Design a protein around this ligand. Structure first.
Ligand code: MG
Ligand code: ZN
Ligand code: ZN
Ligand code: ZN
Lengths: 1404, 205, 50, 98, 129, 7, 50, 99
């Protein structure tokens, strides 16, 4: 007895033979009766020994009730054998490789004794082996035919002799196979073919067939009762007519019981949901019951705003608080507190509903406990939810790490409130809005869950984004506008001041301790900056940034106050500037709340957000804010100005049209006239910058609510205002105008065919306030429908990609070395290459990067002591700068537009620590002290040397044990930052004890920033990269959809994640640098090279071609006039006479003169690119003098050297080969433009200068080899968007860097942290090959993780292959433990807890 | 321009492998004449371990890459001489790596001489200085003792490490063999460079 | 058919021999009953009309 | 009310557990599974009615108590119904050197 | 005759591409039990894991201690708190928690569970209060 | 009503 | 035809929220009757209403 | 709740009569709609409808506002002035809670 605690460590999959069924069966099904009255009939399929599903009886086998009984399998002894439905393909493979007479293998086992085990049998069965002679019994192997009428019948074809392979005969055949043959064919000894035939099937436990799937079982039992029990079928017995039909229907019944309505690739044959149909798809067993679950003790409601709630609070209706209960166990310390809940009971709130008495080991109703007076120790009380309880708040779809957060409950006692109320600043965590969104709320009742909710999942932990490493929450909408209105210097009423009474009223709802106004007279005037400083003095921070209010596009108009365009906060005091989206807005990196979180913790940041939001809202409570129709109304003069601007745009469009009409539009090389015309029209119809002048002439910026919302960043943008007031402009769909889809050349019924006006192609000349006409409204509806379609399918595409990425990355978990490993196989030597949490990073500028050799000496070379130590320190600084420059200039070289930056994300802002210590210092300008300065230098040097020990522990630091090289590299950036910010020049007014404190603070901050052991960093990366994907979809109508540049939708991300080959890429690009640094400046040379490497083939320049059976030294009549220019060619080319091997076959091609002119293709170029290309040929051209009307004709005469298959067919193949020859360019490059490149180079003074005058070729299509062959391109700086090309030519490391770069390009400016891209790239390249995020990548990376691959997709094939291969599935990661009903061993469960026996004995 | 780049870069491939050149160096024109006439060019190099490395530069239209019997005869004859022959390198065109028959003779010859290393490589592997490519980080082979101490500190097996193919261009230029360890200094945008150790596995072909 | 989207458009091109409409449309005919509920729908973003 | 795939992904990204445990087992179909640890097959254990048995190896039954869910038990029963034998290896017992 | 509740036949198409000899002894077939492990505790001076508790480890320690105080309640704390969560948090903060943290570094094939045992009463606590 | 299915 | 003030009032109408007059609700603004049906059938002759 | 311009709204707060803001002439709203719902959505039809209905109520008329009908926002705003209101529909309002 006493079943001890255990955990499943591995799962073994095997084929279950009839012996296993007999061993595991608790009962034998023998009758067809279902129920004997109110009880199951004994021996039937419902027999209670199989388990109980009804309350009306117990099990018998385990003597448990329905809830505690897991069910037990039975046995049905089949009178005739049946084939295993899941392994029909295995039966077919085994039948074709072993002799059906003696069981010996007909194939040569030595032939396949070099393949891997999972492939030996497949290749053995691939060979024909029909008619092969056995070397043991000299029998002839028949043709194993799979019947096309069903999925299980096999036919033996002996040179036309047809006999049915019955399961009994198959078992006789399979029982003669030795285990030696099984092993030599790559199969496990548990995969002997004798298990593929079942004489005793297993009827599943009733637990999986509750009281249809039992109809099939009943029918199977009934049909099995018909077959005689002594039936003995041998090869060639001629079962007459009815045993045959009965056997076929029994086998079909079993096959439909197991595999009905599921196909699988391993299905051989043709023509009540089954067992295997329950598993797959969203509603299947795995995804619906194992990966997710329905739960109890949970609530859902609509969410609405409540500005009186803190960011970490949620408004809970009281009716829900008396439904969900918290389980508090009564002990000595809580009996007094819990007694009021017990006394209130179910009649008053806060009360309780149930009590679990320990003495009775059962739950007691509160209305039956009226005689208990008090509660006993060990009792469990289920009390109502009260204010201050923690709750899990969740909004679906749950895509971010903050999609589930823990809030403190605020119980709303108003009975008429049924919504989940929350602060509007908390919506950023969930991507929620108050327009109908519903959120799930469940209160943790168990002690462990409550501890975790208040310690691990509180929303204060999600204030900093795991994705972007920046703040998530901030002021939104009314709060941003209110902050601007409160902090602005002047109102339309004069100076922005309030009296003491209204200044006090601003702090009424801040929920903080109010500031002191006793030093203010009732008539004293306080500006908004003063009250903002009063609030922000509690968390003093330093801020200096231009506000969103100041925009350069607005500067020519308006009159910006000089005190409003430079926001400065010094030690919590707002000196100047306004507060808006840049400073207080949500998601504003570097904003005031981000700084507050960095210096005082995210809880302080949330409290400050609430306080400042209350301040702004209380200010607007008096200032007022509104938008009216007149806010969007231009003055008549401004309307005339807008009309004039649009008239100028349409006049430029009409000038382009006039150029087209006169045939003056000449497209460049690479574009057709239609494409060039469309590009010119798109450029001509863009609104100028001066469209804002009429708008701002009609707008009073100090009074305009719409302009104030747009300019302060609260809501809207400049295009919104322009569309509302001036005009929408050109409607662009996928970068192009409206296509003529109504008819041939017609965009709408309202416009004529081949209309040239811009209005016919989507140019909207009217503003929204002016109103749109019917065609303008139709074009706008097309654009809006595009937006709606993209929004709708963004959810689905993001779901697909997110699920694939999660299942590809979920097993990646940080271990105790802070490496990332799948089980035990490494993915990263250190997480994010720095071992840091994404929530603990700060962007910091490195001051030495851009300095020249002289400013570096003038700013960092300390000359106050004549010591070599400071020379060494400056040398160390210079070497750090040089290493940084080299690394991040190399990074520039293998990227398209990744510029070297002065700022880095670091765990510790050293300069801020030094500034804080100096500000708190009770000293200043210390006297010169050589000993102190040298001591501080020594301390800093030792701290830098011992910095990588924060990655190990204090013990190894004390022992000074060797540091691994990768850990030394992990601290390189922090060593650089410390040596810069703690340089001797910068630490002259810092004492030695102050230096010790600074170093201790740096060490503490570095330790606090490390990634936790057991973090599911793969899932974090999957979320952080899948979240920007829906925004990437939302701009799908702003991306090109044409061939060669197809970037619409998820085409590029699916290309990246699926590791699609080069030929499968639709937006391949390459970047080529000229192999001459001094001539990259010439745009003409760059254009020359770009047009030179553009791929031109013979087919591009052919109007038509005709192959002829005529030799030369007769002639198709339609071209008898060709002999004139033919003889002219003979006369003009004396050394090009026809050779004496001229054959009958010859092509005659007409050259397209228009294409030749447009592509600058000369006839001599063709003649030399075909003559010195083709060995067995004789080519002739007409006199190129041809004007319009007479054509250039190229007759290519073949030779029998080519003919050295049907002659005509090989001649046509030769024609195809000749046509595809490369006349000009490099293969695979459809287009090649010239782009201006921004690059950094170190000049002779050691300075890093940003150069804008670099020209490079941005090709369409990739060929790294071809681009590296030409000598006009720098071969060492070829950048191609193709991951496969980079992998094939450069290697797996360059492929990893390319994956990083391409994912970064897809994410865009608002992308995740670099460590998530590193996670994606390192998972995909861990095996030395670029594996995908699809099923194939999982198969390559985790073949043994059968459960994970079943959970991803295709459970039936994965299960079948696992059973056949006898796969052992170790339980690791998340999917495998979850499918086994266990919990993943990560997070809180990554490290186990044991009892400190010594301490417990010595401290009872 | 494949043959020119091959000619200029194969010798720096040999030098980067720290191999002393044998015989002499021929001009470009004589090189392509030999490639067209004999069907291939052979370059002999000597390693520091007194072994011999032979590089065979076959032609795209050469007969040795179109008929399997010719390649079999060449490999059997070259392997029948009296030299240590540490490694045989056969540089062929990219579609030659797809013609299964030639790969079959390569495998048969590799099985025939287990102590002899035979590898077939495409043209693009030696058409550029691979270690000088900007996109390729610095790869370096670490001795088995350093790898063993690194694995012992990390409580790791060689099979737990990230894998790299022996046909990886940096690994080929380094001369790494399967079962060896390569230390890679990769540039990092989070830590400003990083160090990773990868396990060299079986080369593709 | 070449349709003038409104009688205003037809009146504008009354003497335009280069724009010879076969029919004139009433502008509200391009919207359904539910879309016509929205007032000044042409002054609103069309997605909001949806 | 369902806590789906994405909710579990979010909870495990926070590294929570003990809430995945609470919701997915205590507030869901979470049950107790018994495995013989000698053959890996589901064993029969009952404390009230004295039952400590294994339909596989009989005198070798060493039943371990494994936390599970009824959904996973049903899933394994379904796999075994398709003639796929599921064997749970179970974590080995670890002993401190005395 | 018209049936509406169709089952939507399900298809899998991407096939997987995973990459003397006697009947069976009592060793190769069987022995699913897995050999017992011995606990190889790394010496305190050879430990390489952090001397600071992770938030996961500290949270798990507090949760375990509070759950144990739910059924027990004999506490070494000085000040009286009315909830097991607060008691466990103060026990961790006052370095009086009776639990230990075992970090399983590696399980060897030979049957050794190499672990590092860490005392939370000599460790850095990252939790808030 | 699992017994509603008869014999 | 509700009277609507487009303004900021305590931050309670942010992100698609609206502040409603309680008096407007009480007077019958948007008030109405919600109807639910409960159809139950006798399974066979062994069941009856009572 | 929603307007005829597609602006959905969840009732987040119900205020008594005394707590509602009111104009100098005693007009108070049934609903208070955030102005920030306007810019990004560009539901100018709702603003124009409010402006027209302000004059309609004082004139006792029910104007047609069907799409594509000839519309002039400037003329309607001038029409507001002829009813005694401002050029915009903006009025002096008092905070109901504080006066
Ligand atoms: Mg919404
Ligand atoms: Zn049972
Ligand atoms: Zn035989
Ligand atoms: Zn057993």
């Amino acid at each position: 007895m006493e079943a001890g605690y255990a955990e499943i460590a591995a799962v073994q999959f095997n084929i279950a033979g009839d012996n296993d069924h007999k061993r595991q069966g608790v009962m034998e099904v023998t009758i067809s009766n279902l129920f004997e009255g109110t009880l199951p009939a004994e021996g039937g399929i419902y027999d209670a020994r199989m388990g109980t599903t009804d309350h009306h009886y117990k099990c018998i086998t385990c003597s448990h009730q329905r809830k505690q009984c897991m069910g037990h399998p039975g046995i049905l002894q089949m009178h005739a054998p049946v084939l295993q439905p899941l392994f029909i393909a295995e039966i077919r493979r085994w039948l074709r490789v072993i002799c059906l007479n003696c069981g010996a293998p007909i194939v040569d086992l030595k032939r396949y004794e070099h393949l891997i085990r999972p492939k030996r049998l497949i290749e053995a069965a691939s060979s024909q082996t029909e008619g092969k002679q056995c070397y043991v019994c000299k029998a002839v192997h028949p043709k194993i035919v799979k019947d096309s009428e069903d999925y299980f019948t096999f036919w033996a074809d002996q040179q036309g002799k047809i006999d049915k392979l019955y399961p009994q005969i198959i078992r006789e055949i399979f029982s003669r196979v030795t285990y030696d043959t099984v092993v030599k064919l790559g199969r496990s000894k548990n995969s002997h073919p004798e298990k593929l035939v079942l004489k005793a099937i297993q009827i599943p436990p009733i637990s999986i067939r509750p009281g249809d799937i039992n109809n099939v079982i009943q029918y199977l039992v009934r049909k099995n009762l018909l077959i005689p029990k002594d039936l003995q079928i041998v090869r060639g017995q001629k079962i007459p007519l009815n045993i045959d039909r009965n056997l076929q229907t029994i086998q079909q019944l079993y096959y439909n019981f197991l595999l009905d309505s599921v196909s699988t690739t391993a299905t051989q044959g043709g023509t009540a949901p089954s067992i295997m149909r329950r598993l797959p798809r969203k509603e299947g067993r795995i995804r619906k019951s194992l990966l997710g679950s329905q739960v109890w003790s949970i609530s859902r409601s609509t969410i609405c705003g409540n500005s009186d709630l803190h960011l970490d609070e949620v408004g809970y209706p009281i009716s829900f608080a008396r439904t969900l209960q918290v389980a508090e166990t009564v002990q000595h310390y809580n009996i007094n507190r819990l007694m009021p809940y017990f006394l209130n009971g179910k009649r008053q709130y806060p009360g309780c509903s149930r009590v679990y008495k320990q003495i009775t080991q059962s739950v007691h109703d509160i209305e039956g406990l009226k005689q208990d007076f008090r509660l006993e120790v060990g009792d469990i009380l289920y009390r109502d939810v009260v204010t201050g309880d923690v709750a899990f708040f969740n909004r679906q779809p749950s895509l971010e790490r903050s999609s589930i957060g823990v809030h403190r409950i605020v119980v709303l006692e108003n009975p008429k409130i049924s919504t989940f109320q929350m602060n509007v600043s908390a919506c950023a965590w969930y991507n929620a809005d108050f327009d109908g969104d519903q959120m799930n709320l469940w209160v943790p009742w168990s002690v462990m869950s409550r501890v975790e909710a208040e310690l691990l999942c509180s929303v204060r932990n999600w204030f900093i984004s795991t994705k972007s490493s920046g703040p998530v929450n901030g002021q939104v909408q009314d709060s941003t506008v209110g902050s601007f209105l409160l902090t602005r210097t002047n109102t339309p009423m004069g100076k922005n001041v309030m009296n003491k009474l209204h200044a006090m009223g601003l702090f009424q709802t801040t929920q903080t301790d109010p500031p002191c106004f006793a030093n203010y007279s009732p008539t004293d005037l306080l500006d908004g900056k003063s009250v903002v400083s009063m609030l922000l003095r509690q968390t003093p921070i330093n801020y200096q940034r231009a506000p969103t209010w100041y925009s350069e596009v607005y500067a020519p108009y308006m009159h910006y106050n000089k005190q409003d365009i430079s926001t400065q906060i010094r030690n919590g005091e707002l000196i100047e500037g306004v507060l808006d989206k840049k400073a207080v807005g949500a998601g504003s990196s570097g904003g005031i709340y981000h700084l507050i979180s960095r210096r005082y913790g995210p809880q302080q940041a949330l409290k400050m957000i609430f306080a400042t939001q209350q301040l702004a809202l209380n200010y607007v409570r008096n200032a007022g804010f509104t938008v009216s129709t007149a806010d969007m109304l231009l003055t008549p003069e401004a309307h005339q100005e807008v009309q004039e601007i649009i008239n100028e745009l349409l006049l430029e469009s009409e000038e382009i049209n006039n150029r087209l009409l006169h045939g003056d539009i000449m497209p460049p090389i690479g574009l057709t006239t239609h494409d060039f015309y469309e590009k010119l029209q798109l450029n001509a119809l863009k609104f100028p910058d001066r469209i804002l002048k009429p708008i701002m002439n009609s707008i009073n910026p100090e009074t305009n609510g719409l302009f104030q919302m747009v300019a302060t960043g609260a809501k809207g943008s400049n295009p919104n205002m322009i569309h509302i007031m001036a005009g929408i402009g050109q409607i662009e769909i996928n970068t192009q105008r409206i296509q003529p889809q109504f008819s041939f050349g017609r965009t709408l019924v309202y416009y004529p065919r081949f209309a040239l006006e811009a209005q016919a192609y989507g140019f909207i000349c009217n503003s929204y306030i002016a109103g749109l006409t019917s065609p303008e409204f139709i074009f706008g509806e097309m654009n809006g429908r595009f937006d709606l379609i993209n929004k709708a399918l963004s959810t689905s595409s993001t779901g697909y990609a997110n699920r694939k990425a999660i299942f590809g990355l979920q097993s990646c978990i940080v271990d105790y070395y802070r490496r990332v490993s799948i089980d035990t196989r490494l993915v990263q030597q250190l997480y994010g290459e720095d071992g840091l949490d994404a929530r603990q990073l700060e962007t910091v500028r490195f001051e030495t990067i851009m300095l020249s050799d002289q400013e570096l000496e003038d700013k960092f070379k300390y000359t106050g002591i004549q010591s070599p130590l400071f020379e060494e320190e400056f040398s160390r600084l210079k070497k750090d700068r040089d290493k940084y420059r080299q690394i991040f200039l190399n990074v520039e070289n293998f990227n398209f537009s990744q510029l070297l930056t002065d700022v880095r994300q670091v765990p510790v802002n050293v300069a801020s620590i030094v500034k804080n210590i100096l500000l708190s210092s009770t000293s200043g300008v210390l006297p010169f002290d050589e000993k102190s300065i040298l001591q501080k230098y020594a301390m800093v040097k030792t701290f830098c040397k011992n910095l990588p020990y924060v990655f190990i522990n204090n013990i190894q630091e004390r022992l000074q044990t060797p540091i691994p090289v990768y850990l030394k590299r992990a601290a390189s950036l922090m060593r650089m930052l410390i040596r810069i910010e703690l340089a001797t020049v910068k630490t002259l007014n810092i004492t030695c004890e102050q230096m010790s404190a600074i170093l201790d603070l740096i060490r503490l901050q570095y330790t606090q920033s490390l990634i936790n052991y057991g973090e599911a960093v793969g899932i974090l990366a999957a979320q952080s990269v899948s979240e920007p994907l829906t925004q990437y979809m939302l701009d799908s109508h702003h991306r090109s959809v044409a061939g060669g540049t197809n970037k619409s939708g998820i085409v590029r991300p699916q290309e990246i994640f699926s590791a699609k080959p080069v030929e499968a890429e639709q937006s391949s690009e390459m970047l080529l640098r000229l192999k001459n640094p001094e001539v990259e400046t010439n745009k003409t040379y760059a254009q020359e090279i770009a047009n030179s490497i553009e791929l031109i083939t013979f087919e591009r320049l052919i109007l038509q071609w005709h192959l002829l059976y005529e030799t030369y030294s007769v002639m198709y009549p339609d071209f008898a006039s060709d002999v004139e220019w033919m003889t002219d060619f003979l006369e003009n080319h004396p050394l090009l006479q026809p050779p004496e091997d001229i054959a009958n076959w010859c092509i005659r091609l007409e050259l397209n003169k228009t294409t030749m002119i447009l592509k600058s293709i000369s006839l001599e170029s063709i003649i030399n690119s075909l003559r010195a290309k083709h060995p067995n040929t004789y080519i002739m051209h007409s006199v190129e003098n041809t004007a319009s009307g007479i054509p250039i004709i190229i007759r290519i005469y073949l030779r029998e050297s080519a003919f050295r298959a049907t002659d005509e067919k090989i001649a046509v193949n030769v024609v195809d080969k000749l046509l595809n020859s490369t006349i000009r360019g490099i293969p695979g490059i459809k287009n090649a433009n010239v782009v201006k490149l921004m690059r950094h180079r170190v000049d002779a003074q050691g300075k890093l200068v940003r150069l804008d005058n670099i020209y490079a070729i941005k090709t369409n299509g990739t060929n790294i080899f071809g681009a590296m062959l030409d000598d006009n391109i720098d071969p060492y700086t070829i950048v191609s968007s193709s991951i496969g090309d980079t992998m094939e030519l450069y290697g797996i490391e360059a492929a990893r860097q390319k994956i990083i770069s391409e994912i970064r390009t897809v994410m865009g400016d608002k992308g995740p942290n670099h460590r998530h891209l590193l996670m994606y790239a390192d998972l995909m390249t861990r095996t030395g090959q670029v594996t995908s995020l699809e099923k194939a990548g999982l198969n390559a990376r985790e073949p043994s993780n059968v459960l994970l691959r079943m959970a991803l997709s295709s459970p039936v094939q994965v299960l079948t292959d696992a059973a056949v291969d006898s796969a052992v599935n170790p339980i690791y990661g998340i999917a495998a433990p979850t499918l086994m009903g266990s919990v993943p061993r990560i997070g809180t469960m990554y490290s186990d807890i044991i009892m400190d026996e010594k301490y417990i004995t010595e401290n009872y | 321009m494949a043959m020119q780049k091959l000619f200029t870069y194969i010798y720096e491939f040999i030098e980067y492998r720290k191999m002393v050149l044998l015989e002499e160096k021929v001009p470009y024109d004589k090189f392509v004449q030999m490639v067209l006439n004999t069907g291939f060019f052979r370059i002999n190099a000597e390693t520091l371990n007194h072994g011999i490395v032979s590089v065979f530069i076959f032609g795209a239209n050469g007969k040795y890459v179109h008929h399997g019997g010719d390649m079999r005869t060449l490999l059997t004859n070259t392997l029948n001489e009296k030299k240590h022959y540490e490694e045989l390198i056969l540089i062929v065109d990219k579609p030659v790596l797809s013609k299964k028959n030639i790969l079959d003779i390569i495998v048969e010859q590799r099985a025939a001489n287990p102590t002899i290393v035979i590898n077939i490589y495409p043209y693009h592997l030696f058409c550029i200085n691979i270690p000088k490519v900007s996109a390729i980080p610095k790869h370096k082979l670490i001795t088995q003792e350093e790898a063993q101490e690194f694995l012992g500190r990390e409580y790791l097996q060689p099979q737990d490490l990230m894998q790299i193919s022996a046909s990886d261009p940096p690994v080929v230029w380094l001369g790494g063999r399967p079962g060896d360890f390569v230390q890679i200094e990769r540039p990092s945008e989070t830590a400003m460079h990083a160090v990773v150790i990868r396990f060299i596995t079986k080369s593709k072909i | 058919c070449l349709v003038a989207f409104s009688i205003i458009e037809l009146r504008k091109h009354k003497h335009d021999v280069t724009r010879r409409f076969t029919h004139v449309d009433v502008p509200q005919a391009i919207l359904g009953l539910a879309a016509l509920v929205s007032p000044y729908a042409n002054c609103t973003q069309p997605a909001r009309v949806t | 009310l369902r806590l789906g795939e994405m909710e579990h992904w979010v909870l495990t990204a926070q590294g929570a557990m003990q809430t995945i445990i609470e919701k997915s087992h205590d507030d869901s179909d979470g049950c107790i599974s018994y495995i013989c640890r000698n053959c890996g097959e589901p064993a029969i254990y009952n404390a009230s009615h004295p039952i400590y048995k294994c339909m596989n190896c009989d005198v070798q039954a060493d039943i371990g108590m494994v936390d599970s869910r009824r959904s996973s038990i049903v899933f394994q029963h379904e796999m075994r119904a398709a003639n796929v034998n599921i064997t749970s290896v179970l974590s080995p017992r670890v002993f401190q050197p005395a | 005759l018209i049936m509406d509740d169709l089952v939507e036949e399900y298809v899998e198409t991407e096939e997987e591409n995973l990459v003397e000899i006697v009947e069976s002894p009592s060793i190769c077939e069987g022995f699913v039990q897995a050999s017992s492990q011995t606990l190889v505790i790394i010496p305190d001076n050879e430990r390489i894991t952090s001397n600071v508790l992770t938030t996961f480890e500290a949270t798990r320690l507090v949760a375990v201690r509070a759950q144990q105080l739910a059924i027990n309640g004999s506490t070494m704390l000085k000040k009286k708190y009315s909830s097991p969560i607060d008691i466990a948090k103060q026990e961790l903060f006052n370095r009086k928690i009776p639990l230990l943290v075992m970090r399983c570094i590696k399980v060897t094939p030979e049957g050794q569970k190499i672990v590092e045992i860490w005392n939370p009463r000599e460790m850095g606590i990252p939790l808030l209060d | 009503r699992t017994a509603d299915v008869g014999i | 035809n509700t009277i609507v003030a487009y303004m900021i009032y305590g931050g309670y109408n942010q992100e698609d929220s609206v502040i409603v007059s309680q008096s407007f609700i009480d007077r019958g603004g948007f008030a109405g009757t919600f109807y639910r049906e409960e159809k139950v059938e006798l399974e066979s002759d062994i069941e009856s209403f009572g | 709740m929603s307007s005829r311009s597609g602006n959905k709204g969840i009732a987040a707060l119900a205020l008594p009569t005394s707590d509602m803001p009111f104009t100098e002439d005693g007009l108070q709203p049934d609903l208070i709609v955030n102005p920030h719902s306007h810019p990004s959505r560009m539901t100018n039809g709702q603003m124009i409808e409010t402006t027209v209905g302000l004059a309609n109520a004082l004139q006792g008329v029910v104007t047609d506002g069907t799409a594509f009908l000839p519309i002039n926002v400037q003329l309607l705003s001038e029409r507001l002035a002829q009813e005694g209101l401002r050029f915009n529909g903006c009025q002096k309002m008092f905070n109901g809670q504080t006066g």
